[PDB]
Write a protein that binds this ligand. Structure first.
Ligand SMILES: [Cl-]
Length: 226
């Protein structure tokens, strides 16, 4: 039997991302548009800071800015929580701790609005050093990849995840971002609660030479594995 959720992702699906952020009192907004093809675990998106200059580094927002587009191997289809929650969707919450610096707290709703998959996010950042690697824009812009370790949260009918991102500092060194994640379904319907597994995630960051606004072009591959 094929779920309504699974069926929604068999072709190319348009994506819309909307983020409202406040880090150390610096307010900003980001809009993103693109396409996802879950059959190949493939995402292509362009993000624009709609408020001017982004007050934090683009690479620090990649994880916040749609794990429903992961390629789940057929033998792991019973563990795909993210698609099982669709179209009504899920809430995704995180705390992201930047080592020796501040933290982000995020809350997002990921759901269909018509035929478009929407990720609407609120982000709050506190305790950042004004001359630190984040507010000082000292991180490299190129590539972000890691494994996302997923476990069921039976009590909340959802999942938890934890993972680390290593951001290269431009003049040398590494800035660690420790991620803690919880996802809960929006609807009351049945969902798939997975066994322990991970998502292998790789993203390439680029620029559009015709784009004068502060922006990020992203190519991403996400694949579930045992
Ligand atoms: Cl940046």
């Amino acid at each position: 039997m094929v779920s309504k959720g699974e069926e929604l992702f068999t072709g190319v699906v348009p994506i819309l991302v909307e983020l409202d952020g406040d880090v150390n009192g610096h307010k900003f907004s980001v809009s993103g548009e693109g396409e996802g093809d879950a059959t190949y675990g493939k995402l292509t998106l362009k993000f624009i800071c709609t408020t001017g200059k982004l007050p934090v580094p683009w690479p620090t927002l990649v994880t916040t800015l749609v794990q429903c587009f992961a390629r789940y191997p057929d033998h792991m289809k019973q563990h795909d929580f993210f698609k099982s929650a669709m179209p009504e969707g899920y809430v995704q919450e995180r705390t992201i701790f930047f080592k020796d610096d501040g933290n982000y707290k995020t809350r997002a709703e990921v759901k269909f609005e018509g035929d478009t998959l929407v990720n609407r996010i609120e982000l709050k950042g506190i305790d950042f050093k004004e001359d630190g690697n984040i507010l000082g824009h000292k991180l490299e812009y190129n590539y972000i990849s890691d494994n996302v370790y997923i476990t069921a949260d039976k009590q909340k009918n959802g999942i938890k995840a934890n993972f680390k991102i290593r951001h290269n500092i431009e003049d040398g060194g590494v800035q660690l971002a420790d991620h803690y994640q919880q996802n809960t379904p929006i609807g009351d319907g049945p969902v798939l609660l997975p066994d322990n597994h991970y998502l292998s995630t790789q993203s390439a960051l680029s620029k559009d030479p015709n784009e004068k606004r502060d922006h990020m072009v992203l190519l991403e591959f996400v694949t579930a594995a045992g």
